[PDB]
Design a protein around this ligand. Sequence first.
Ligand SMILES: CO[C@]1(C(=O)O)C[C@H](O)[C@@H](NC(C)=O)[C@H]([C@H](O)[C@H](O)CO)O1
Length: 161
Amino acid sequence: VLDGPYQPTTFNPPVDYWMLLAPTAAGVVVEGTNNTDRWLATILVEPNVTSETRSYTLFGTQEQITIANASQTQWKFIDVVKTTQNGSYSQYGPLQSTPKLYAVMKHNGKIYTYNGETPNVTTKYYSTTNYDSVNMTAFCDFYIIPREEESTCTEYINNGL
Ligand SMILES: CO[C@]1(C(=O)O)C[C@H](O)[C@@H](NC(C)=O)[C@H]([C@H](O)[C@H](O)CO)O1
């Protein structure tokens, strides 16, 4: 029933499908850009991290990002975004997670990602021009779930595979 797992790759996912990502290591989970007004990379941060600056490879280049994770026990997925090519990266929409799963979707002129704290997650979005043609690079195994089955994706984010 569940469509996957697919191996790490860059492709152009259809609109109104969730890319359910199953990372195993801390670090960059997924990234995508329209090359004009949106870059988004999701970073997975370890439980229990006091403010510190780390180096991440985002869109092929080293970037210094100051990260934290206030939770003693839960993972933190962070959307690191910029809105112009040479802009600074800013952090939004944290998901605190036990199951270690995330998902991203292209929908209605935006990129959506999961947010909040498992097991009661919600979603939030980032307006993105030419949203439909955004290529996503997965750095881990992933699955594909139609928006019609969002309740299934939400259950996976909340409770695991
Ligand atoms: C312009 O308004 C919005 C948008 O994109 O539609 C509203 C949206 O709710 C908000 N999402 C979050 C997680 O904060 C988003 C980001 O602040 C911004 O895209 C970051 O670049 O801004």
